[PDB]
């Protein structure tokens, strides 16, 4: 297949915590972006086979998507909020690497990223 194995959503050896910040990332940030009208391309790994993107995984070596992030949050996969924020950042910046200006996906990513940043600016202080 053109598609690599998807990023893991669990691993017994991953060190894991629950924090109020991670809870906010699931209950507010992910939830808000998941229900957005532009979420749909980002709700699962890029399927380069079905979508006829034979160079996608030639260019993008650290893929990420919100389906993966959602499952990671549900599985308490993260050690801290920063690890989760980094996955969102990877998701957005992969688009800015792969796509060109004006592409549908890049305009959608930009809108979701603006909203992400607005929600992350209200991340609670860790208790
Ligand atoms: C095709 O490019 C990406 C698709 C996706 N993801 C995705 N998931 C399900 C359906 C779907 N259809 C779909 C979207 C857009 C288009 C354009 C334009 N032409 N045909 C298209 C079909 N797409 C994610 C991506 O990056 C995160 C992409 O950009 C590399
Ligand atoms: Cl992915």
From Swiss-Prot:
The record marks 99 as: Acetylated histone binding. Phosphorylation by CK2 disrupt the intramolecular binding between the bromo domain 2 and the NPS region and promotes binding between the NPS and the BID regions, leading to activate the protein and promote binding to acetylated histones. In absence of phosphorylation, BRD4 does not localize to p53/TP53 target gene promoters, phosphorylation promoting recruitment to p53/TP53 target promoters. There is a cross-link at residue 58 (Glycyl lysine isopeptide (Lys-Gly) (interchain with G-Cter in SUMO2)). Belongs to the BET family. Interacts with p53/TP53; the interaction is direct. Interacts (via CTD region) with CDK9 and CCNT1, acting as an associated component of P-TEFb complex. Interacts with RELA (when acetylated at 'Lys-310'). Interacts (via NET domain) with NSD3, CHD4, BICRA and ATAD5. The interaction with BICRA bridges BRD4 to the GBAF complex. Interacts (via NET domain) with JMJD6 (via JmjC and N-terminal domains); the interaction is stronger in presence of ssRNA and recruits JMJD6 on distal enhancers. Interacts with NSD3. Interacts with NIPBL. It comes from Homo sapiens. This is Bromodomain-containing protein 4. The chain holds residues 44 to 168 of 1362 of the full protein. Residues 17-123 form the Bromo domain. The gene is BRD4. The NET domain mediates interaction with a number of chromatin proteins involved in transcription regulation (NSD3, JMJD6, CHD4, GLTSCR1 and ATAD5). Changing residue 99 to A: Abolishes binding to acetylated histones. JQ1, a thieno-triazolo-1,4-diazepine derivative, and I-BET, a benzodiazepine derivative, have been tested on tumors with success. Treatment with GSK1210151A (I-BET151, a I-BET derivative) has strong effets on mixed lineage leukemia and promotes myeloid differentiation and leukemia stem-cell depletion. Chromatin reader protein that recognizes and binds acetylated histones and plays a key role in transmission of epigenetic memory across cell divisions and transcription regulation. Remains associated with acetylated chromatin throughout the entire cell cycle and provides epigenetic memory for postmitotic G1 gene transcription by preserving acetylated chromatin status and maintaining high-order chromatin structure. During interphase, plays a key role in regulating the transcription of signal-inducible genes by associating with the P-TEFb complex and recruiting it to promoters. Disulfide bonds: none annotated. It is linked to Cornelia de Lange syndrome 6: A form of Cornelia de Lange syndrome, a clinically heterogeneous developmental disorder associated with malformations affecting multiple systems. It is characterized by facial dysmorphisms, abnormal hands and feet, growth delay, cognitive retardation, hirsutism, gastroesophageal dysfunction and cardiac, ophthalmologic and genitourinary anomalies. CDLS6 inheritance is autosomal dominant. A chromosomal aberration involving BRD4 is found in a rare, aggressive, and lethal carcinoma arising in midline organs of young people. Translocation t(15;19)(q14;p13) with NUTM1 which produces a BRD4-NUTM1 fusion protein. It is found in: Nucleus; Chromosome. Ubiquitously expressed.
């Amino acid at each position: 297949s053109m598609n690599p194995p998807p990023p893991e959503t669990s691993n017994p050896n991953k060190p894991k915590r629950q924090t109020n910040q991670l809870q906010y990332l699931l209950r507010v940030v992910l939830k808000t972006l998941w229900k957005h009208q532009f979420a749909w391309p980002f709700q699962q790994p890029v399927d380069a086979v079905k979508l006829n993107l034979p160079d996608y995984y030639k260019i993008i070596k650290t893929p990420m998507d919100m389906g993966t992030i959602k499952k990671r949050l549900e599985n308490n996969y993260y050690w801290n909020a920063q690890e989760c924020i980094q996955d969102f950042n990877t998701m957005f910046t992969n688009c800015y690497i792969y796509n060109k200006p004006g592409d549908d996906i890049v305009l959608m990513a930009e809108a979701l990223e603006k909203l992400f940043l607005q929600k992350i600016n209200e991340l609670p202080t860790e208790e």
